[PDB]
Structure formats: C-alpha cells, structure tokens
C-alpha cells in the first residue's frame, strides 16, 4: 500500500519508512505541507500519515482539502502528534482525522493503526 508519510524530521520519517517497508507497504515522504500537496496526484497515496505540527500550513485545512475531490475524499488520514498531551488537545479540536498515533510510537502500534483504518477504509 502507498503510504504518504508527512513529517518534518528526516530521522522520524526514516524510522516510519523502515517499519513500513519491512512490513510490505510502499512508503513515500513529504517534509512539509506543499510537498504533501504536490503528491496528491498519480500515483495517489492510499493513506496519509500527517504530522499535526507539519511545516507550511494547517492540518485542519490539509484534511478539509482532501474532501474537496472525490478522488482524495476517502483516503484515510492518521494524525501523528508530538506526545499524548498534544494528542488529547488535537482530539479535542475535531480535525476530521481518521485515527491518531503519538510519537514516539512502537512498530506494533504504527502497523496496527494503519491496518485498522485501511480495513474499514
């Protein structure tokens, strides 16, 4: 599955990509909002992992943007946060994300979350 990993920190993206490739997914990287937007075209991501604090714009507007076109409307988005305190706050904001994972995360939790959202699509 093509997983778009949107996160500022190279070593974090790389840890994510490693876990995903070891598990048979096809991860690709975006370091900021515009890079992610530029990859909303063929080949389309099947799921997006989105850092809440991503440089370059708002995670709320990023998610609303996906809903603007039927093509991207149904792509699951898992929000990545920088620890549980931020996760609770972002849960509170009703951002429209499909699920949430906080950093640092285990390989088990990363795969479990991605699998769960993809299974219910």
Swiss-Prot record:
Listed GO biological process terms: phosphate ion transport; regulation of DNA-templated transcription; regulation of DNA-templated transcription initiation
Record localization: Cytoplasm
GO MF, one annotated term: identical protein binding
Superkingdom of origin: Bacteria
Keyword presence, Transcription: yes
Sorted UniProt keywords: Activator, Cytoplasm, DNA-binding, Phosphate transport, Phosphoprotein, Transcription, Transcription regulation, Transport, Two-component regulatory system
PTM characteristics: Phosphorylated by PhoR or CreC.
PTM annotation (4-aspartylphosphate): residues: 51
Cellular component aspect of the GO annotation: cytosol; protein-DNA complex
Domain Response regulatory: 2-118
Function statement: This protein is a positive regulator for the phosphate regulon. Transcription of this operon is positively regulated by PhoB and PhoR when phosphate is limited.
Stated name of the protein: Phosphate regulon transcriptional regulatory protein PhoB
Range within the parent protein: 3 to 123 of 229
